[PDB]
């Protein structure tokens, strides 16, 4: 299908992959950037179904959603268990998903809000 760069900057919002739930499409590098003001912080929240191809022995070969919180890495997530809910400290959040050229996963929905310092 897509993938522009998306940018939310709200106090809150829901971020998915593309045709979710339904199967998200092959050979993505999708980047979606979260930028808030100065003294927020972003909280991020999985809502279920999160279902993103894997493996049973490799850690994340073929598909990968990635999460930075002001460029520094806090996570790679695949497989069918959503991740658990992230206080990022941060008012700066990337999310870069990275999907391979097949399969049938139907991907990833969250909420991010913000908690005022
Ligand atoms: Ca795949
Ligand atoms: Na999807």
């Known amino acids: 299908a897509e993938c522009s760069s998306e940018l939310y900057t709200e106090a809150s919002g829901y971020i998915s992959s593309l045709e ?3 199967s998200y499409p092959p050979d993505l590098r999708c980047n979606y950037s979260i930028r808030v003001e100065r003294g927020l912080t972003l ?3 999985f809502l279920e179904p999160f279902d993103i191809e894997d493996h049973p022995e490799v850690p994340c070969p073929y598909d990968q959603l990635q999460i ?5 890495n806090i996570g790679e997530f695949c497989g069918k268990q959503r991740p658990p809910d992230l206080d990022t400290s941060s008012n ?3 999310l870069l998903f990275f999907t391979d050229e097949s399969g049938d996963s139907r991907g990833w929905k969250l909420r991010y809000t913000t908690e005022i310092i």
Request: avoid cysteine; hydrophobic fraction near 30%.
């Open 20 to 22: 979710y739930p339904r």
């Open 43 to 45: 909280h991020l929240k």
């Open 68 to 72: 930075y919180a002001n460029g520094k």
């Open 92 to 94: 700066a959040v990337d």
